[PDB]
Amino acid sequence: LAEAAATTTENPLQKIDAALAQVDTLRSDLGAVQNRFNSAITNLGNTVNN
Amino acid sequence: SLTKQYLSVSNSIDETVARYKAQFTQLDTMMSKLNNTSSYLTQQFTAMNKS
């Protein structure tokens, strides 16, 4: 479990920004995969017709 | 940042909407072709049976 804090924390922004970077990277990956999904769908439609 | 994220999401959404609509358009063109072919096939059957 998480422990309590006995002292004020330093350089909090240098951690918050790192967390934001992680979130941005994950969001980028999630957005990206959808493009591959759409390309696959279009290709599959063409292949089905053929 | 937030209205910015809105700019980004609006843009992405718009790309997706264009994609879906385009797929539908191409599909409907294929429909046009097949419908016409089958329609004249049908008339041919009707006449040759009326024979």
CA distance B16 to B22: 10
Task: Check residue A8 and report its DSSP letter.
Answer: P
Helix or strand run (H / E) with residue A27: helix A13-49
Name the nearest CA neighbour of B23 among A48, A4, A12, A21: A48
* Method by which the coordinates were obtained: cryo-EM
CA distance A18 to A11: 11
CA distance B5 to A49: 38
Are B26 and A42 within 8 A, CB to CB? no
Name the nearest CA neighbour of B28 among A7, A45, A36, A9: A45
Are B13 and A32 within 8 A, CB to CB? no
Q: Please give the residue of chain A at the shortest CA–CA distance from B15.
A: A35
Residues of chain A with Cβ-Cβ distance to B23 below 8 Å are 41-42, 45
Q: Please give the residue of chain B at the shortest CA–CA distance from A41.
A: B23
Chain B contacts in chain A segment 18-37 (CB below 8 A): 31
Q: Please give the residue of chain A at the shortest CA–CA distance from B27.
A: A45
Who's near A38: CB < 8 A, 6+ residues apart? B16, B19
Task: Check residue A4 and report its DSSP letter.
Answer: P
